[model samples]
Target chain A: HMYAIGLTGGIGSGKTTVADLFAARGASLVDTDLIAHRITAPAGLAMPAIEQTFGPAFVAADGSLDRARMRALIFSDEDARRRLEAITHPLIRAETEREARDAQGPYVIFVVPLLVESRNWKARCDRVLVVDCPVDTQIARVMQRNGFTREQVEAIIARQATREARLAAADDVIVNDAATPDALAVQVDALHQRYLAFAAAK
Target chain B: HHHMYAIGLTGGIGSGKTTVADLFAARGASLVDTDLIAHRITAPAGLAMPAIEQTFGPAFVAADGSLDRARMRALIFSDEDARRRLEAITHPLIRAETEREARDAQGPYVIFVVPLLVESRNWKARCDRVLVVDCPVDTQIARVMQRNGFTREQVEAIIARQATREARLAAADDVIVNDAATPDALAVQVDALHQRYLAFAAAKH
Candidate 1:
């Protein structure tokens, strides 16, 4: 219902910071990653079905989906991951649609980390915005923030849609390699004004 | 280049994919549900457990030694990095198990019933021929309503959520039309495909 901009980048690409900037400028933000947590949180809408289908063991003591054990199996198992998607993706997609439909800002920034990786996502967005930086930047930012080893960060980066691929899909690129938050803020300001005009015209 | 025949069977919700799979099974087509293979591996003390436990910390493993599916599901869906990590671990094991299923199956060819076949990134390319079980949209909605007591809106909603008919048709190399047509007609159609697939596999060999 709104002009949709798909925001995506590799891990540690400073997408969240850009999203925050956009949010401050009155763009509606629908963060799939944040919604993902809601679906698995204690008393989550998906918890009942997840518990029923997977067995009682999947529900944690606090009535939340068990993240500790669930993460282990999914990372190592493709089919397990697919099965989980079968359950979660639809729910996520529906909620996303609703969120977009209800969005009230100039336009909606549908912040999906895997916009390039997902099927038909490009078609859903009016434009795809890629947050660009070097792979090393991603690894370093993630390692410093998460306290993970360089190898661990590298592994995560390797799992993502390649930087080149994300760049290839972009209708717009916001270079996130700026030396200061002020520079990043300036870039966002320009984009924010551009999006307001784009949304109004659309 | 698989050693045995594998057909990618798929359909939308209430399209009777399972029934078609069953008919093929009755005619001696072995069924290999990829879902079951995944569940077993992540089951307690299963083959995939050791590598899983070693790669991830203790928090990710359950007291019963099975996968903490909820915990893992959340992580993968939210975190692309985690999703890829898990796929690296489970895909090879599923492939090996499917190979075994192909080797051990008593059927003429295997029907791998993948629910979201059209939606899967590479499934259409991998199968010998993609067999889509086709049913009319209204028929699908009505049938689900009768069988499951879901409202018409609910049935339609579910169908709306799956791959579009255009997408499914683009993915399908073969189609099995399912309507009231005739009890005997369904069998004849399935049997013909079975024979054709059998010869196709023979030609490959």
Candidate 2:
């Protein structure tokens, strides 16, 4: 059990950039979203159950979960979404735990997009780090980067925990709104130092 | 504004909420069942389809484009992750739809048949009056066991989760104690309430 930091942000909060900065400085990363995709990927542990439950149409040509098809179904059908999650979530947790157990960094960074929305992830972490910005900043960044409509970005934001809720839960907050890449790196570097000490203290 | 009087009707499972609400409806009250609204919104080409499809994916939708309820029920029973997520998507839609029906109602008054009205806390504010269907806890357990083929323990577990008979009575502006009452006796009580509700609505003007 290494010292753990649960890192989270809204859709366009630059969590990946901050997480990469930590990874560069030797904090091992276990990304839940990435782990989710891995379990649904070709030859993945969850594929057989997914295919059997959802029918072969849900499996893509390369033998992966058909993300596009599944996404459409989940949006139109709430029950189907739960079914998919039931098949994938436990597998994702097992894989994430295994990765954490084997991680050799000075500390572990668990990048969870919905950490604030989750039931117990906050208690599991030694510290909760939120990459935060104004809702407008999140909407703008997501709209530009993902080529999504403003309404689309807004809808995604609506589904996540509120900015106030996230900030209230945070043990650490790094503003991603106005910072340039270099400026953001400076903040990350300083936290990296503090976390190294925290990990060492543990 | 829909100037008609609004009544929030509720009780624990098998407390004869349906029978009471039906009596009100037969006496010319509009009935809005939240459970029915939930079903309509998840039906094929339903208002919630686009968002549900986008959030969940196509496999969750049946061939007719409705929610695959059977599969969804199994998942809900087995996993916790999707429970709140699914509710978050559907609840607002249900609320909005419920309000829409209430607004468009044509009866002399409206009865919002909310099974969880007491549990929901805020629903009390929406109605001018809350009418609770009262019965003994043992009666409730017996009724549900008979109706759903659940064991007494299973029925008792559900009863334990619901607001108690006293809590419901405390919240009520009106009460109809249905325990040991025949259908004709129940209808007679409803007739008196219907007349009282009509008088109340008349006073509003």
Candidate 3:
């Protein structure tokens, strides 16, 4: 009932693309980022504590975490970033655990951004699936999608665990540097069957 | 030493935490005071000010570019949400820097002096011992009123926000009652604690 496959990758590494393929193949998705958004939504569970801890100015008019101001705080203030993490990380873990507990699919794919950085994530999951891509490709993809400059993307990449580190931690790798959609589908289909077998065995 | 013992020291605002912490420091226990760290980060051109100013506006900042304690306190006292807002900005910075300093601390052991330790979650689990400084609420009110020139009412308001005396006692692994005791008397008790803590630290290794 608790078979989890941790899905991770650097930003712009086609994690979303690969995750979508797995979702289509019946793997349940537990996206931490999505859960983060829900908790910070208007009058969400963490809002009261956030409002009390940060003040009303940090909450938007709709009563959610003020994304624009929050982003500005976290980018510049490392301490503030950790503070936000302190408030949200526990709530996020609780929600993810609940979601995983009720996962109806053959296996659960946890799309975690900093899975490698978390040290214990590897041991917690049945396997780590890293969506790999070249640093240049990641830069180009992020630059195109988020309109961030090359330097901005590079800064983000530098802050994260390196491609080599993620690869080293991974149990399975999907090198999406230039893989076609069909090729990715084939890989997902194969992994799906393997995970199904693993789940059944467990 | 294989392991350094961590003691979480706490009490209400006027609980003579400073006195107890000083005793530990004299005995070679490194001191990591969260309140001091919080003040440093919120002082003029402090780490949290930019974000605080950005979130609460320039009016919340004093002429020296530090947090406006007077105006902000008034706001939080009236507007509960405002208090949370201020905490949201500062508490994280304080918590972050506290851990940062603790990692670099050099001593036989550590005493993390947290004024609001009982009210905070997870602080209890981080320490080898929780040492609460206890005193009657009236003594706290008197000490604060004379020390800070506040009315009895204002001191009570401040203590009202803190964990109750019973709550702090319930959370304590040890307690030092500092109610109008002489410094020599205080030192005697601290000396005993120092020996016990030293033995505890030695046995762990």
Candidate 4:
């Protein structure tokens, strides 16, 4: 059996960068967010169900999901967000599990951004790897990267588990505070080697 | 607020569920074994005593502070009407207690060790995930004999009362196969499961 490492970080905490570095270092990564995006894409398995629930206005002129409108609606309406999650989460989970089971790698790294906040995924990972950065850094990163204002970025942060909470749940922590990409790459390499050994031993 | 992920482990009497749950717990998970709770609820000075006594006659309670389980079983077994009466009294209390315990879970996820989840369907929706421990009939009988000194006939009778293998498997989010392996090997599977479920649970939030 192969070992799995659950990689997580709060939004704008450079989780994607860390995942890329891990991949560069020879770890096969499975991302749930990517799976969710695929499930909601045009002609996706869940598109028909989503259209039925929310109607044609949710679809774009090109027959794809109008992601901007969907995001706007879900962010403001808790019930709408919940209904969408209900429709998509199960399908995404099933697909991700299938991929994990069939993954051909020494170790599989499942990138789950909400690993600390969601109780259900904690048991699915062998090791919890957290990508850490200061709150100010996160706010700045999100503001600059997504062009979101301070308030919007802060609201998103509010929904995530606190830095302290994520830290408490971490089995391994990679601090990504430095400006140099190579510095973060070193940590990813170390983790890749560690997980590879762990998977082999298992 | 942190969410509690709940995985319910269930199977028939001889399905080696306890062994599976033990492996999960040993791998750093908290557990709420419903059968143990059932035992506690019927013990001396239990909270349900007054209700049980009021529902059933005082003779239902044995002289020794224990419930007259044999007598109660016989009463229910002989008549369908008697079984419904017993279910009416016990089922609600059991469901309420299970929910209360699940709410109090302190771990990242909870393993609700219920041996009859598929049959009752009472706790199926309560769990975020369901793990079924399973084995062939002959393996179940052999394991039961080694564990509890029960004869093959007794074990088979217990199995008959529980949900069928197909029913259990249909409801399972994951299945732990315990028939062909030792406890240590089973632990490896449980550990792998632990990793997968943890990742999946975290993705939800």
Candidate 5:
């Protein structure tokens, strides 16, 4: 018997902070972003093929993806962004599934940033846990954290699914608009107990 | 004409360099492998037929009319000076053909796969960027044995003659690690890179 949780939220929504609470409570966490980063790291599995196909400009001085350059391109050009997604998304999904299957915990929390927007990973989990926050809060937080301007942060948020869309899809919604570390930890502790029971019942 | 951004990739045997080139191609970037060119060049009545025959004599041309690779390999292995002389004639010819083909490429960028890119610094410098495909020596040896039916010693010798990992690492403007995971995993990294580098090229233009 297995229970898998898909944790997701838009950028600047304090999803990582929520994830940290879950981790502290001993949830087996699988982060897609970390997996994606590893795949793109210099001399990582994907570099050789990428270099062969796209040439060297796609790589940076440190051999990581030129993330800044990529962010700019994806926002400005639709086709190019789609092409880039086409190459990476499937591969990331495959790796995520592989990691999830090998996870040792009774319940697994797979953190995906684009879970709602992509909607492709819904079938992979038993429940979807969305970290929710106000749109204004999201924009302001992102702008402050990443040093992006208000407009840039707004643009990024606009590309994501609306809060209502995420809420409609969620099995559990963690309202993070005014969350404190203690409050978040309490929610995680409750979920941990629930998930443990759910796993045993299954 | 749109200026094409070119990236040259090279590494030792079993470095997963071919996999890197394939990932780039999958991302819609045009590619040219110089080894494939070398194979074609020395084929019977191929591009380098006249030059190879003139330099090595008829004995280097077998009854099948193809260049005798076995005989040529033996000659080069026995005489260091002869190998350098052969390279002098063949390398330039290969470079000219590669350059002509690259100029005709119609992509936002072109990836040139050169096995000897580090050794041929002048040729590598022609490209706008350099990506070095890398893996551990043990990984290289294991992969080569599995893929090419080569012994560990055989692969080791090949690796020994090529650029040291540190040297290639130092010369690289970019490095793609090939040792950590599967090809599919690598493809994801490649896609992310494609997004970044292609944008840079466009901005430059």
Candidate 6:
């Protein structure tokens, strides 16, 4: 009765646009990146602990995570990245489960950018529905939207589960390489109906 | 590390932490209530909402797009993992904001009313001294039960979760016995501490 799709993709893969369409039709959406923003946002939940652990050097003048400074530190030191993830990931997982249980919809759409890398996330959801797109598409999209340079976007993608790994792990795939809103909506409808009875008999 | 001396005020459930903080606030100390800051950060369109929504799901977000306090707060109390996770997200933010409040304080010092100052690692160190509002645990339970309509066990559970009397006292550099016979009695203690701190600040400066 609680069958849900793990909607996941890398940065700039149009996950938000796709998730938005399903929300309009009453499919509850839970997203990790969005939550991370809040957790790390100015005066966020993670700030105090972060300040204590990492000290004021990693914190910004606004009392938020000094993301720019962190990125610079992470570029050379890998453990810092691991430490930050350890802190953020558990918090993210706890919230996702709570949201899914509270959702009032046909089924839940759980969006996680790091779904594949999380290693165990796929087993929790009934299906892993990857919003597939080319690596180039991801880089271009992120660069265009976030105004990051090609090198920067590429750096981000380099850290994610590769395109092949994501597709291999997927139970369902939506080729979101490119599409108009209407086209994406049409794509959402098919999966919406398919997931209607996904957990019914199984 | 204290720029102008700060006091970390804390007490268990219903120990009059807020009331005590107000008396200090009246005497020109900047009051940074971590509980109030937590609410502000988690309110609708609050800085923490976006993350709360993402981690927990859109369902946790209220109509105004802020945290659904009742729903989420209930979940946090009953679920240990959720509680820890929630703290992880909010604690650092509170500490950081508290420091900012202290820095920008217009007075000679800041009064930080942190709910978990004792339990949180090194929070006691952050303050020049930890001021605990002292009262019997039973009175704490009785007050909270009447104020929130919580059961005795519910109130007791919260009390149990907080730092024990011994641990809190051990951490305290100052103490205010709020369970004294009258408001005037409480005021006398506060006024004396105010003078002490005023002297403390002047001497330190």
Best by lDDT: 3
Task: Report chain B TM per candidate.
Answer: 0.69, 0.87, 0.93, 0.87, 0.91, 0.93
* Model 5 bad stretches (over 4 Å): B1-205
lDDT string, candidate 4, A4-94, tens digits: 7889988888888989888877788899889888766765655544664677789775556788899888878988887777666655555
lDDT tens digits, residue span A1-202, model 3: 3578999999899898999999998999999878888988875656644654466678887878898787777777888777677767656655665577578998899998889987435545778999999998988898889576576577678888988988998989999999999999999999999998998897
TM-score of chain A of each: 0.91, 0.93, 0.93, 0.94, 0.90, 0.91
Candidate 1, superposed: residue stretches over 4 Å from native: A148-152, B1-205
Candidate 1 lDDT score at position B114: 76
Encode model 2's per-residue lDDT on B37-58: one tens digit a residue.
8898788766565446655667
Candidate 1 vs candidate 6, TM-score winner: 6
User: Model 1: per-residue lDDT, tens digit, B71-103?
Assistant: 887676567677767765666456445544554
Best candidate, TM-score-wise? 6
lDDT of 6 by residue, B94-156 (tens): 554554455557888777888788896457655667899988887888789889888787777
Count of residue pairs whose backbone atoms collide, per candidate: 17, 18, 8, 16, 15, 15
Better of 2 and 5 by TM-score: 2
Expressed as tens digits, the lDDT of each residue in A1-202 for candidate 2 is: 4688999999999899899999998899999888888878876666654664577688787888888788778766878877777556555544555577678999999998888787546645788999999988888888778566676577668778999999999999999998998999999989999999999997
Interface root-mean-square deviation (Å) of every model = 18.2, 20.4, 15.8, 18.3, 20.8, 9.4
Which digits, one per residue and each the tens of the lDDT, describe model 3 over residues B66-175?
88888887798778887887776667566556655665778877888988788876466456789999999888988898898877766777798899999999989999
Please give, for residues B1-205, the per-residue lDDT of candidate 5 as tens digits. 2345778888889999988889898788888888887786677655455445645677988786678988988787668777876675556556645654665677778888987888764545457788888889888888899988876765776787788999999989888889987888888878887887798679756
Candidate 3 deviant stretches above 4 angstroms: A1-202
Off by over 4 Å in 6: A1-202
The residue-by-residue lDDT of candidate 5 on A33-109, one tens digit each, is 88778767764444433453455687787776777776787677887576565445544654555565467877788
Please give, as one word, the docking class of candidate 2.
incorrect
